[PDB]
Design a protein around this ligand. Structure first.
Ligand SMILES: Nc1ncnc2c1ncn2[C@@H]1O[C@H](COP(=O)(O)OP(=O)(O)O)[C@@H](O)[C@H]1O
Ligand SMILES: Nc1ncnc2c1ncn2[C@@H]1O[C@H](COP(=O)(O)OP(=O)(O)O)[C@@H](O)[C@H]1O
Ligand SMILES: Nc1ncnc2c1ncn2[C@@H]1O[C@H](COP(=O)(O)OP(=O)(O)O)[C@@H](O)[C@H]1O
Ligand SMILES: Nc1ncnc2c1ncn2[C@@H]1O[C@H](COP(=O)(O)OP(=O)(O)O)[C@@H](O)[C@H]1O
Ligand SMILES: [Mg+2]
Ligand SMILES: [Mg+2]
Lengths: 77, 107, 190, 538, 93, 317, 53, 528
């Protein structure tokens, strides 16, 4: 379910198809969909508390340490 | 580089002329060392072990076993001299000299 | 490096510039071994062999003096302090805390009975745990304590850490030599 | 006594990483073994049933081919004797264009048999004597084995039938189509004069439509676009300039020295008026197409668009020279309007899109010209490169036929007849030379042996059949590829023929290579360099 | 993976020619020690010893190899020496 | 041995092959004894250095210098030692013919070779393939090198060196004060990945200075794209920088980033620019003169006698 | 999500792997089948040799 | 083998030889096919690949997917090559080509494993390919009426089919109209550079649009650009290659004066040069000005005061499209600005499109150009939309040049499998197996459609084999019904050249891969 292809040969000889196939990863099928959905759900559940008049803000800190307090979803993301 | 080195890559080999050269060179080296032992006008050699012990000798067998040598031909000649000494007690220096000179005159 | 480091002169120049970093003797033979040959040794050797034989004889007589007991014995709790905490100075003590009930304890005791005769220098004792320690837990046997000069040197405790019912008279011997008490001549085989 | 020391002399004075081999055992047999490994590396590609190989070079580039010389170039042959055999094979490729795999096979076979003879007790000198005398006999014999001749190289059916053999070994499945294409191209070229130039056959590889979409074009194709607004022209009056399409400037240095507001106001207008005059003179000579080997200026392009001239820019100088030969023009180093002789003409010049590629086509309608192009379509760049190699083989065969029109039977017929006749010659020669002559003869058997092995049949059955039929008197009989079982047939009546010159040079070069490899007795390799490669070869 | 990382496997005409070449090499080692005009070899044991001989089995016994075909040829020589006590070079050749 | 004279538009930096440092840095390198051992050198001490911007102006001067970098600061004879001279990239043929006439005719050198300074710089770093960005005091050069030779067709030449660099800084006039600006140029001048985030807390772009040709990263990218598509990987991944100009700002990562941007998303570009041995060209020349392929590349004295300026130009016109 | 301390193959991947393994094992021995089959050497990482069909 | 004191090739040369090498090549090709299988058909999915730079690409296009995979296997590179070749010559079928090639290889794998000579296999492949190609050309439907309404219907259906696999299928009828409207405006070469595709993030797919004219993004305006007007109702348009700003009259130009009157004359001369250019541009009647080169702030304010529009730094392609649309010529000189060279449109505007400002030239009736403006919620969303439209556009062009249509859903694949099975049952028996294998391989397209859809491909292929043997040639997979159907009546139309080139390319790839009997990798030089 990861690590690209892994057989290396039914004859014992090296099987190199993709560059850095050993360092590369891959997700296929329904598990990929479920990963996508979890990622999206995490982002959306982060944002949903900044929604409406009683919505709260988020304090974003950049690489150089500047602070930005905001309720704007575009600025947050 | 040869037949033996294709099967055992870490093999050392001296063939025909090279082997003769190796052996005769070692014999001539032993002779050059021992030439001075022969006779009463010869010179005494001092031999210091790895421990520091001192040996004063003019004896061919003693000098052979005490010299610091790692040659196969020298091993052969040392054993011949050791047999000479074990059976007769004398004749080791002359043994080495005649061996070396036979090899030289044959070369 | 830019090129593969192999038997080439370019790498060698780079290396030079600073880039591409680049039966032995009668001394050991025992009393039995010395007898084995006797004739082999040259007389000149035999002169120093006399001294080495006297040395080995002295060492063997010393060990004879040291082999006080050579047998397993049982001590009660009451005299434990004298037998273990105050044993002979420098004398290795091995105490087997055990109840006769547990069969693994009996196996360990049989193995200790063998090792006692095998190792007459080490002191081998056995004792009922309930009678040595006030309320020693039932499921905590056999307990092999290794003592020296009253100090605990090792403690193989438990019916599981000791080495299972398959424990022959060999792996226990090694476990006891782990702390350097009985000093066997082998390795941990099983 | 646990180390053998290097013997006094050369063994000790030799450098650290250097190697020294001497004698039959350390040198001759090792060289023969290396050449044998080479011949084995390239044997399975010999003939129409030869299989392709996928060689990846040090730059990770891929070559898929059964062209021996290509495989050898792209292999990193490091043994010097094999290097020498490859040098011979490349000389064959240079002189003739086809037959490199014959050179390899034959040299490897001669060297194997020479090793055999040295083992039975012959000296390298006697082996060389016998090999040379037998090569002389082979050259004396070959002229008599010639069966056919071309008899016409202006035809297209005869020329196609003649090129079919050379382009069959490569690209076996489709050999009538390619032979037709190469015959069309070759006969458009090849003027009334007996000289034929192979660089005048251009090959344009465009991708995506299968090889059967390949075509011949009496003209030129450039994977370029047009610089201006005009894209088509029906009566091209091409003007060719080696200079840019811009105002000429000084070779020393130029500075616009202004000293009055008037000069400043008038300089730029004067520049554009000058450009307008230049391009209008060019347009007024009648030129509707201008092809410049240099750059194009924005103002000059403006005015070329204004006067309806198609502008084409060829970065290369060889492309410009070949276009000049194509259209009958002269590259002018100045932007001066061309004279009636300096101008070139084409029945059409247009911008098209062959596949994904945009191309500028200079197309004549006449079935002639100085240059012809073969547009190769194909689904893979590697496939198209292999077909280009097949085209090169066919074109070099056409040139060999312009040089020498004689033909010998193929499919191993010439080789079997040579083997037979040289064996019959060696049986008469007494002395120690007969052994080497008979081995030189038997070496020819390696060719039909390789053909049989690659067809998928028993080489011994094939060779026995060929020997039997050639004893009955048939010198044009060779093996049949179209047979699941060992079979043989008339190479002539089938039309499978090789070039007298091809065989001549292949035998000569293979024999010289083997004899050269044998003459070596001592090898003194130096420690491998890290040097930035040979300076001259760049 | 399926087989161990240290597991290599060769197959085909390569193996055959390799075994035959190893055998031919073993034969070339002692080819000159055959007959009444043979010459001696001074082999160096790993114990610092020396063995001067023209005996096929002595030579092939003091050599060690890693190719299994060469191992088979040395075992040939051993078998011949144990059975009949002569022919240790003729058999190899 | 082989004398390796590294002109390098610097000093003479001459010596022998095998030495890790030159032995004859003449420009800006006893008394009361007897003889002419100071006067003869006192003459040269105040002689103008011929090479300007990487090009020889006065040849008599250069010849007198070489002669004084052979007989005085090396105390050797050129009639028996091969010489390796260095030339700037895209150096006119005429200068080559002149120096080859000087060496073979005046100094009677048995054999000599002229190498490109960027190629020797790459050699001193241990590699044989890559694209060298050499930016010194007067010129900027991108030299693609494959198999150890400077491809003579992909040498893109733009001009943004120490002078052109310190120019805008001066803008932000007198010799001493523009040399205060140049002292700041000599000192830390950290390259900015993004001038936005670098000026916030306060060559790549021609408009910055005022030029209208190309950046140095564009120059490297196009010099790599005018080479073989297979060696493209090596050019992109072995970009080696040299020159005190480019060292002063220490520009590695800004280049790397925008070159990665320009290149396809395949080749990984790594720039090795930390050496600063202050004799890179000399060490590269020494490596070459130590090799045996240098004997291979020798323009010999006999070759010179037989061909002349044609042998210096290596034919192939 | 699982958090198992190991790797997991599932579906066509593991089936293809199993078939690849079995095929590998069978191709080892396919060449040793029938009157025309040939033997194999096996070297035990120490020079211990075993010839067998 | 033996050490051999000196080796033939360079140390590190990896040589794979024989039947194992061939089977490994086939397996690598199978891997490459698997990498794109699930993108096939209306139920196909997109793939997300990520580069070293960290930029993600999301695509249903097989050519794109395989270009992004860093395939290095020498035999598996061939499938990538044939997908590229298909994208080049046709523009659709890139996944089908790879599937077909890999399936040919898979089908012949058993015979290869048992020592069948590859030449026999390539002969069979060549034969069956020629047969199937001639059969496609034979049964392809080519309406011989040249009616315009039917020729627009045909293109719309072919485009809808080419688009019924993308993320724009739920608006594919929409997009199909536009694609046809797009290619029906191109003149005779159908240049793709003549169709502009702008991607304006923000908005829905239905908010996307086609402009029968030209449109391009605002270009680095100077001060005074907001003083300019932004709508013109019959403008004449000056298209130029002219830098309009105070500049050095030439870079090698040096002024030398020795008088302050000459100094002032020179200053005023530069100003008069510029103002003269601007005055010529103004008197040509042009109310809109576009320059391929910069237009400085002075010129910007000049045109703002004359109530004209100016845009500089316009990209060359957008200028050429403006030319082909408005009907003028691009001028490097302003000295002859005749109405002959000026362009004209019915409306010029500058509007806001999703955060960006865009100039629209609309109303050009003589327009040989169109500009797609694509909306969407992501860079990659719009990029895959563009790729889908590129497929549809290339399809429509090929159909325009040859309106010879076959049916899809595997209808043509099943018909060719039938025809080749029949043909194979009439030949000796060695080629019989291989041509039957070709036939069995052709069935991978409907099988993969059914797989990606979630059906029982076996039952559906049984239905199809039966219905194609009973009489019936355009029966294929009906996806929404999980059944079969006459796809030619359902309007699943596909230009014949698509499948023709797919078979040709796949067969060539298979023949190539199968002809290789040895692979020799030299060790990498400049190791690093
Ligand atoms: N006084 C002497 N005068 C001449 N020759 C002598 C004298 N004494 C011994 N020799 C000879 O010198 C030779 C070498 O003597 P020595 O070194 O003892 O023998 P070896 O070489 O075996 O050790 C003997 O052959 C002996 O005959
Ligand atoms: N149809 C055929 N039948 C038999 N042999 C053929 C046929 N076509 C070519 N050959 C033979 O193949 C050999 C040349 O094949 P090729 O692989 O190109 O080798 P070379 O590179 O030496 O020409 C010649 O011996 C030629 O006679
Ligand atoms: N004087 C001789 N002349 C010719 N052949 C001989 C002579 N002596 C022995 N042979 C033969 O030559 C071979 C010599 O055998 P040898 O070198 O001892 O090796 P081995 O006997 O171990 O094979 C034997 O076949 C022997 O019969
Ligand atoms: N609505 C549909 N119903 C059934 N089959 C379809 C439909 N649309 C397309 N197809 C089929 O799907 C295949 C298209 O494959 P796809 O991956 O979409 O593009 P490509 O042509 O690049 O493979 C063709 O065989 C086509 O006939
Ligand atoms: Mg040929
Ligand atoms: Mg499609």
């Amino acid at each position: 379910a990861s690590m690209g292809t892994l057989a290396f040969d039914e004859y014992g000889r090296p099987f190199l198809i993709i560059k850095d196939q050993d360092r590369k990863s891959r997700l296929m099928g329904l598990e990929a969909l479920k990963s996508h959905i979890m990622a999206a759900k995490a982002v959306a559940n982060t944002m949903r508390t900044s929604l409406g008049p009683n919505g709260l803000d988020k304090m974003m800190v950049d690489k150089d340490g500047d602070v930005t307090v905001t309720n704007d979803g575009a600025t947050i993301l | 580089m040869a037949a033996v080195k294709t099967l055992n890559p870490k093999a050392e080999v001296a063939r025909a002329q090279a082997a003769l050269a190796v052996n005769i060179s070692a014999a001539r080296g032993l002779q050059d060392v021992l030439r001075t032992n022969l006779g009463p006008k010869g010179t005494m050699k001092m031999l210091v072990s790895g421990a520091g012990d001192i040996k004063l000798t003019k004896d061919g067998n003693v000098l052979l076993h005490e010299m610091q040598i790692q040659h196969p031909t020298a091993s052969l000649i040392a054993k011949v001299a050791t047999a000479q000494d074990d059976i007769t007690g004398d004749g080791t220096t002359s043994n080495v000299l005649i061996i070396g000179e036979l090899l030289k005159q044959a070369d | 490096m830019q090129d593969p480091n192999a038997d080439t002169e370019w790498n060698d120049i780079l290396r030079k510039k600073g880039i591409l970093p680049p039966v032995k003797t009668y001394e050991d033979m025992t009393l039995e071994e010395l007898e084995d040959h006797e004739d082999e040794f040259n007389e000149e050797d035999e002169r120093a062999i006399e001294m080495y034989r006297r040395r080995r004889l002295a060492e063997w007589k010393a060990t004879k003096l040291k082999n006080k007991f050579g047998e397993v014995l049982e001590i009660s709790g009451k005299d434990y302090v004298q037998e273990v905490t105050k044993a002979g100075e420098g004398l290795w003590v091995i105490l087997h805390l055990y109840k006769q009930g547990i069969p693994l304890c009996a196996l360990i005791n049989q193995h200790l009975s063998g090792l006692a005769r095998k190792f007459p220098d080490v002191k081998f004792i056995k004792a009922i745990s309930t009678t040595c320690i006030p309320n020693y837990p039932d499921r905590n046997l056999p307990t092999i304590f290794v003592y020296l000069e009253g100090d605990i040197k090792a403690q193989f405790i438990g019916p599981l850490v000791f080495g299972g019912m398959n424990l022959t008279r060999d792996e226990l011997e090694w476990k006891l030599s782990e702390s350097g008490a009985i000093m066997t001549d082998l390795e941990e085989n099983p | 006594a646990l180390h053998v020391p290097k013997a006094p002399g050369f063994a000790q004075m030799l450098k650290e990483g250097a190697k020294h081999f001497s004698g039959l055992e350390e040198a001759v047999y090792r060289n023969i073994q290396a050449c044998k490994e080479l011949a084995q590396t390239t044997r399975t590609a010999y003939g129409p049933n030869g299989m392709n190989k996928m060689v990846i070079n040090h730059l990770e580039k891929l070559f898929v081919t059964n062209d021996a010389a290509t495989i050898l170039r792209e292999l990193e042959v490091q043994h010097p004797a094999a290097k020498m055999i490859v040098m011979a094979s490349h000389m064959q490729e240079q002189e003739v264009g086809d037959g490199t795999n014959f050179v390899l096979v034959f040299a490897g076979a001669l060297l194997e048999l020479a090793e055999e003879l040295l083992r039975i007790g012959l000296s390298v000198s006697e082996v060389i004597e016998g090999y040379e005398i037998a090569c002389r006999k082979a050259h004396e014999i070959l002229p008599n084995l010639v069966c056919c001749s071309a008899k016409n190289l202006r035809d297209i059916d005869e020329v196609s039938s003649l090129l079919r053999t050379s382009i069959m070994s490569k690209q076996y499945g489709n050999e009538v189509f390619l032979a037709k294409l190469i015959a069309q191209a070759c006969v458009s070229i090849f003027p009334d004069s007996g000289h034929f130039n192979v660089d005048n056959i251009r090959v344009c590889k465009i991708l995506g439509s299968g090889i059967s979409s390949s075509s011949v074009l009496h003209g030129m194709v450039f994977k370029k676009e047009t610089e201006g607004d005009v894209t088509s022209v029906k009566d091209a009056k091409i003007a060719v300039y080696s200079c840019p399409f811009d105002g000429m400037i000084t070779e020393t240095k130029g500075t616009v020295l202004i000293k009055t507001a008037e000069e400043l106001m008038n300089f730029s207008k004067g520049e554009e008026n000058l450009m307008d005059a230049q391009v209008k003179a060019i347009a007024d000579t009648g030129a509707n197409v201008v092809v410049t080997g240099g750059k194009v200026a924005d103002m000059a392009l403006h005015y070329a668009n204004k006067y309806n001239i198609m502008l084409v820019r060829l970065n290369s100088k060889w492309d410009l020279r070949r276009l000049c030969k194509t259209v009958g023009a002269t590259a002018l180093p100045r932007l001066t309007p061309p004279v009636l002789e300096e101008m070139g003409h084409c029945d059409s010049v247009y911008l098209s899109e062959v596949g994904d590629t945009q191309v500028v086509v200079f197309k004549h309608e006449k079935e002639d010209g100085a240059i012809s192009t073969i547009v190769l379509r194909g689904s893979t760049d590697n496939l198209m490169d292999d077909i280009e190699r097949a085209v090169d083989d066919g074109v070099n065969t056409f040139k060999v036929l312009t040089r020498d029109k004689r033909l010998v039977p193929g499919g191993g017929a010439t080789e079997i007849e040579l083997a037979k006749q040289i064996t019959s010659y060696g049986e008469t020669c007494p002395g120690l030379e007969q052994y080497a002559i008979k081995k030189f003869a038997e070496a020819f058997e390696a060719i039909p042996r390789a053909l049989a092995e690659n067809s998928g049949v028993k080489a011994n059955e094939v060779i026995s059949k060929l020997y039997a039929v050639h004893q009955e008197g048939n010198k044009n009989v060779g093996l049949d590829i179209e047979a699941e079982v060992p079979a043989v047939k008339d190479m002539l009546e089938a039309g499978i023929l090789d070039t007298y010159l091809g065989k001549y040079w292949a035998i000569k070069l293979a024999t010289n290579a083997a004899v050269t490899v044998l003459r070596v007795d001592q090898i003194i390799m130096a420690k491998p360099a890290g040097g930035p490669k040979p300076p001259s070869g760049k | 993976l399926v087989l161990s990382q240290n597991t290599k496997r060769e197959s085909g005409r390569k193996v055959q020619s390799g075994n035959i070449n190893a055998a031919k090499t073993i034969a070339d080692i002692i080819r000159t020690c055959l007959g009444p005009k043979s010459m001696m070899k001074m082999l160096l044991d790993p114990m610092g010893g020396i063995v001067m001989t023209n005996d096929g089995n002595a030579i092939l016994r003091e050599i060690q190899v890693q190719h299994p075909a060469a191992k088979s040829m040395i075992e040939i020589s051993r078998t011949q020496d144990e059975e009949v006590g002569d022919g240790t070079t003729s058999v190899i050749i | 041995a082989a004398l390796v004279i590294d002109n390098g538009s610097g000093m003479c930096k001459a010596g022998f092959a095998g030495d890790d440092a030159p032995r004859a840095v003449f420009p800006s390198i006893k008394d009361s004894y007897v003889g002419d051992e100071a006067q003869s050198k006192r003459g040269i001490l105040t002689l103008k250095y011929p090479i300007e911007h990487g090009i020889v102006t006065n040849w008599d001067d250069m010849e007198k210098i070489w002669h004084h970098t052979f007989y005085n600061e090396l105390r050797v004879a050129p009639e028996e030692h091969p010489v390796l001279l260095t030339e700037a990239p895209l150096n006119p043929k005429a200068n080559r013919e002149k120096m080859t006439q000087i060496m073979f005719e005046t100094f009677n050198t048995p054999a000599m070779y002229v190498a490109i300074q960027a190629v020797l710089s790459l050699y001193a770093s241990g590699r044989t393939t890559g694209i060298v960005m050499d930016s010194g005091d007067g010129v900027t050069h991108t030299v693609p090198i494959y198999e150890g030779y400077a491809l003579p067709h992909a040498i893109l030449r733009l001009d943004l060196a120490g002078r052109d660099l310190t120019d805008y800084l001066m803008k932000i006039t007198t010799t001493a004060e523009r040399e205060i600006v140049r002292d700041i140029k000599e000192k830390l001048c950290y390259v900015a990945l993004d001038f936005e985030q670098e000026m916030a807390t306060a060559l790549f772009q021609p408009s910055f200075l005022g030029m209208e040709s190309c950046g140095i990263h564009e120059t490297t990218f196009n010099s790599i794209m005018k080479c073989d598509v297979d060696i493209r990987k090596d050019l992109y991944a072995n970009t080696v920088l040299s020159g005190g100009t480019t060292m002063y700002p220490g520009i590695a990562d800004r280049m790397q980033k925008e070159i990665t941007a320009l290149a396809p998303s395949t080749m990984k570009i790594k720039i090795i620019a930390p050496p600063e041995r202050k004799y890179s060209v000399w060490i590269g020349g020494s490596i070459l003169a130590s090799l045996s392929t240098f004997q291979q590349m020798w323009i010999s004295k006999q070759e010179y006698d037989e061909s002349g300026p044609s042998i210096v130009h290596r034919k192939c016109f | 999500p699982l958090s198992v301390f190991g790797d997991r193959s599932t579906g066509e991947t593991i089936r293809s792997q199993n078939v690849m393994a079995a095929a590998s094992i069978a191709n080892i021995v396919k060449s040793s089948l029938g009157p025309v089959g040939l033997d194999k050497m096996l070297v035990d990482d120490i020079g211990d040799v075993t010839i067998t069909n | 083998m033996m050490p051999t004191p000196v080796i033939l090739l360079k140390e590190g040369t990896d040589s794979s030889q024989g039947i194992p090498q061939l089977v490994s090549n086939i397996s690598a090709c199978q891997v490459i096919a698997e990498a794109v299988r699930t993108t096939l058909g209306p139920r196909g999915m997109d793939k997300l690949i990520v580069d070293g730079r960290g930029k993600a690409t999301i695509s249903n296009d097989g050519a794109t997917i395989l270009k992004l995979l860093d395939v290095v296997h020498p035999a598996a590179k061939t499938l990538v090559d044939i997908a590229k070749s298909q994208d080049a010559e046709v523009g659709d079928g890139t996944t089908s080509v790879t599937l077909l090639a890999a399936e040919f290889l898979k089908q012949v794998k058993p015979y290869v494993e048992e020592g069948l000579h590859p030449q026999i296999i390539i002969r069979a492949f060549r034969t069956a390919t020629q047969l199937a190609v001639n059969k496609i050309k034979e049964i392809a439907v080519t309406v011989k009426k040249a009616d315009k309404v039917e020729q627009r219907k045909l293109l719309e259906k072919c485009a809808m089919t080419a688009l019924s696999s993308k993320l724009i299928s739920q608006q594919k009828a929409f997009f199909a109209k536009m694609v046809v409207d797009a290619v029906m405006m191109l003149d005779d070469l159908l240049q793709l550079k003549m169709i502009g595709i702008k991607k304006v993030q923000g908005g829905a797919l239905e908010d996307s649009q086609l402009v029968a004219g030209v449109a391009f993004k605002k270009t680095f305006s100077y001060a005074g650009f907001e003083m300019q007007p932004k709508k013109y109702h019959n403008p004449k348009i000056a298209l130029l290659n002219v830098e309009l700003e105070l500049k050095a009259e030439k870079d090698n130009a040096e002024i030398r004066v020795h008088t302050v009157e000459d100094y002032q004359a020179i200053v005023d001369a530069e100003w008069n040069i510029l103002y003269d250019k601007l005055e010529k541009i103004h008197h040509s009647g042009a109310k809109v000005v576009l320059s391929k080169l910069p237009i400085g702030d002075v010129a910007t304010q000049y045109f703002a005061d004359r109530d004209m529009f100016c845009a500089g730094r316009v990209p060359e392609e957008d200028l050429k499209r403006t030319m082909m649309a408005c009907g003028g010529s691009i001028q490097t000189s302003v000295n002859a600005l005749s109405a002959d060279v000026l362009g004209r449109c019915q409306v010029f505007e500058e509007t806001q499109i999703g955060g960006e400002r865009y100039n629209f030239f609309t109303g050009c009736p003589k327009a040989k150009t169109c500009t797609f403006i694509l909306r969407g919620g992501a860079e990659q969303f719009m990029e895959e939309t563009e790729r889908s439209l590129h497929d549809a556009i290339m399809i429509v062009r090929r159909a325009i040049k040859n309106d010879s249509v076959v049916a899809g859903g595997g209808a043509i694949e099943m018909e060719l499998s039938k025809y080749l099975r029949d043909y194979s049952r009439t030949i000796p028996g060695k080629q019989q197996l291989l041509i039957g294998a070709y036939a069995k391989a052709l069935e991978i397209i409907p099988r993969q459609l059914c797989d990606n859809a979630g059906f029982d491909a076996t039952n559906i292929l049984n239905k199809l084999r039966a219905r194609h043997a009973q009489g019936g040639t355009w029966y294929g997979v009906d996806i929404n019904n999980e059944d079969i159907a006459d796809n030619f009546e359902a309007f699943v139309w596909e230009p014949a050249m698509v499948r023709i080139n797919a078979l040709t390319a796949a067969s060539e790839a298979a023949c190539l891969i199968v002809s290789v009997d040895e692979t020799i990798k030299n060790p990498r030089s400049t190791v690093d």
